[PDB]
Symmetry: C10
Subunit: 72 residues, 10 copies
């Protein structure tokens, strides 16, 4: 089961990488849009937060799937 | 079947990575477009949501295919 | 045929990654263009949809080819 | 010939990835350019289509080469 | 357990890579947005900081998961 | 010579990837520049075409080199 | 322990890569924001410096973790 | 010497990838700059050409080095 | 110790890659910011130089660490 | 010493990739900045050239290090 540790480790690493850069950029860019024009400022950042929920859904479910695949 | 765990783990990791960055950026950029000009604001974000459905279709189907390939 | 599972799994992962980021960005950017100027708004998003068809053609055919290569 | 399946699978995956992101971005950006200014709108999108033909030429020929290399 | 060291090492490397580029860009872009327009300057940078917390949550949890997978 | 097939397959995949994204983006961006300002429109797109010739020179020669290396 | 050297070497390489590009871009973009508008110029660059501290925290801790994993 | 073929094949693939995307983008962006403002148009594109010479110097020398390393 | 050569070779390659693209972009973007507005031109480029020092610190230390890991 | 050839080949490939894209983009972007505003045009491109010297310093030294590691 030594390979399983790496499989999950790389999968999680991939999950962290994807959501990490996706959300990092999502926050800054969201912020940049708000700064450019003061139109629906709270709403734009709120959309950003839902984006965070959506993007992180993938790494969370990916980790769960990796766990189950290793388990069964 | 030890290799199968890694195959699915990396495939899912790839799926999470692609949709995660694609949707993260899709949300922020969508938001940025809305902020730049107050034209069809609800529609633009709605298009973003359909984009989410389209982009995540790929990781969902990819995971399913990986499962079946391992299974058969 | 254990290697075949990984071959298809990584190929599909690659397919999901390419189209996922390509279409995710295509949707948001398409949206951003429409937001910037209200010129041919329906047409621009329509072009985006055909872009989706074009980009996903690659992962779909790639998956099919992977299946056949494994099969024969 | 088990390695051959992976060789073609990864090559095609690479082909799908390159053209998929290249064309996805080509469509959205082409669209963005048209939206920014209403100058030679049909021509710009047409150039985009030829771009599609050019970019996909690479994955198509790559797949063919992979097939022949495996074959001979 | 020699493979375990690499599994965690690459996972952490992936974690550092994702959050490192995500937060690096988040800080500069956040800064760029503030510079472009003097609207809600403290708030925009504050949003950036929460972005940092969100993005680094992934590498921190990823490292923890890698540790546990190696442990059990 | 089983490894040779993969060597060429990955090299070509790399060639398709580099030129595919390079030319895809070159076409759309070239198009975007023309759209932004109606200055030397034919010339700008022409420069784009020479760019295509230059960028694809690399994958073409790379494939040839891979073939010869396998051959000798 | 030969694999351990590579594990740390690649982890550090990953650490250098992530922070290197993250901070390189953070410095230039920070600079670009300041150049665009003369608003809170010292503060913006200062935020950039804290960004540097944050981003490099990841590679530093990653290297430390790699060392300990190899050690124990 | 079977590994040597792959070493050169991947090195060349890397060379084609780097210069291919670097020059593809260099041509389009160069073009975009010229389009934005009609200032020193011939000179800007000329600088682009020297950029091509500089960027391709790397893949050319890399291929030569790979050949010699295999040879000796 | 044959693996050690590759470990350092890839680590250095990673170091060169990260700082190379980080500093290459840092120089051009820094330059672009200065060109956009003639405000604190020497200072902006100077900040760029310190950025170079910061970014290259990572590859230099990474190479040193790789050397020591191989050594001990 | 068969692995050594690949180690240097991939390291050089990495070196060419990093500097190739870094300098390719540095030239075009430098050019774009000059085109946007006619301020210190020779100086900006000159800064670009020093950027080239800085960025290529990394691949040159990386290749040298790879050679020595293989040698000793």
């Amino acid at each position: 089961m030594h390979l399983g540790v790496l499989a999950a480790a790389i999968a999680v690493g991939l999950g962290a990488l994807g959501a990490g850069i996706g959300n990092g950029l999502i926050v800054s860019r969201t912020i940049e849009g708000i700064a450019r024009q003061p139109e629906l400022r709270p709403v734009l950042q709120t959309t950003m937060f839902i984006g965070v929920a959506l993007v992180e859904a993938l790494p969370i479910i990916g980790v769960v799937f990796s766990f189950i695949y290793l388990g069964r």
